[PDB]
Design a protein around this ligand. Structure first.
Ligand code: SFG
Length: 265
């Protein structure tokens, strides 16, 4: 019905929605870790596919979790919503990974897989024109999913996140041992309910990647994490609201992007 208690994240969202463009502009990257993408923009302008520049900021995002042991890509990796291929190409550089298969929607308003020759590119298959929500599940050892379309209405993000979770349940049952699944809106009620069930069935925990922008509450359900989900989410909302109410902003902390090298494996 209506009149239910609200989570601390719902008010971060309501607050965010009442920010001016200027406040939004100054807040979204204040205090976050940001990768220097200048060289990657030149490599893109020049069609340089052997310089080791990732196709997106998603690569550095996944490296952060992998280097910290939150997810151990290995064997056969499937990448639902691969977009340009940032996660897929990064995984192909890992020793334990044997094969990477990426699926992405593509078309109008959606990113297309990019052809690159980063290290291990021969192990990467990226397919556009695949709506993962209608694809029958396949066997894999590592399941990755980064699908989360933002919206100003939390009820819309909520229904979208539950959709993603119900879908990965089909793929997790095909022998997956390691996973990393994006949770676009982890503070909504129907999401916390589905997440609690999903954690019970498959383990893992919710982490926040500091390279994420303050303009979103997205978190990642990774098999290498653990802990009460509510506390995990609330810690993030608390962090986000402290950053929103700052006046003196420091801007992002810049660090160097991932280098993917080149050559076949
Ligand atoms: N039902 C869907 N099926 C397949 N792909 C989708 C679907 N919905 C959204 N997408 C795409 O999934 C992608 C999500 C991206 N965040 C992927 C980022 C990627 N991990 C990277 O590092 O570059 C978007 O490009 C969407 O076009």
């Amino acid at each position: 019905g209506g009149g239910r208690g609200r989570m601390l994240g719902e008010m971060w969202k309501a607050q965010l929605n009442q920010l001016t463009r200027q406040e939004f502009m100054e807040y979204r990257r204040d205090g976050i870790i940001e990768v220097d993408r200048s060289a990657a923009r030149k490599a893109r302008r020049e069609g340089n596919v052997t310089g080791g520049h990732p196709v997106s900021r998603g690569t550095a995002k996944l490296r952060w979790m992998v280097e910290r042991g939150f997810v151990k890509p290995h064997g056969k990796v499937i990448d639902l919503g691969c977009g340009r291929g940032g996660w897929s190409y990064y995984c192909a550089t890992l020793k334990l990974v044997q094969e990477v298969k990426g699926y992405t929607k593509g078309g109008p308003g959606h990113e297309e897989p990019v052809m690159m020759q980063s290290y291990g590119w021969n192990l990467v298959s990226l397919k556009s024109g695949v709506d993962v929500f209608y694809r029958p599940s396949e066997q894999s050892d590592t399941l990755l999913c980064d699908i989360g379309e933002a919206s100003p209405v939390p009820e819309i993000e909520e229904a979208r996140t539950v959709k993603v979770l119900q879908m990965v349940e089909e793929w997790l049952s095909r022998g997956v041992e390691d996973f990393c699944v994006k949770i676009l809106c982890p503070y909504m009620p129907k999401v916390l309910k589905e997440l609690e069930k999903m954690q019970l069935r498959w383990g893992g925990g919710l982490i926040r990647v500091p390279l994420s922008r303050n303009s979103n509450h997205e978190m990642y359900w990774v098999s290498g994490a653990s802990g009460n989900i509510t506390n995990s989410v609330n810690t993030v909302s608390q962090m986000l609201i402290n950053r929103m109410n700052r006046t003196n902003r420091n801007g992002p902390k810049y660090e160097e992007d991932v280098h993917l090298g080149s050559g076949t494996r």
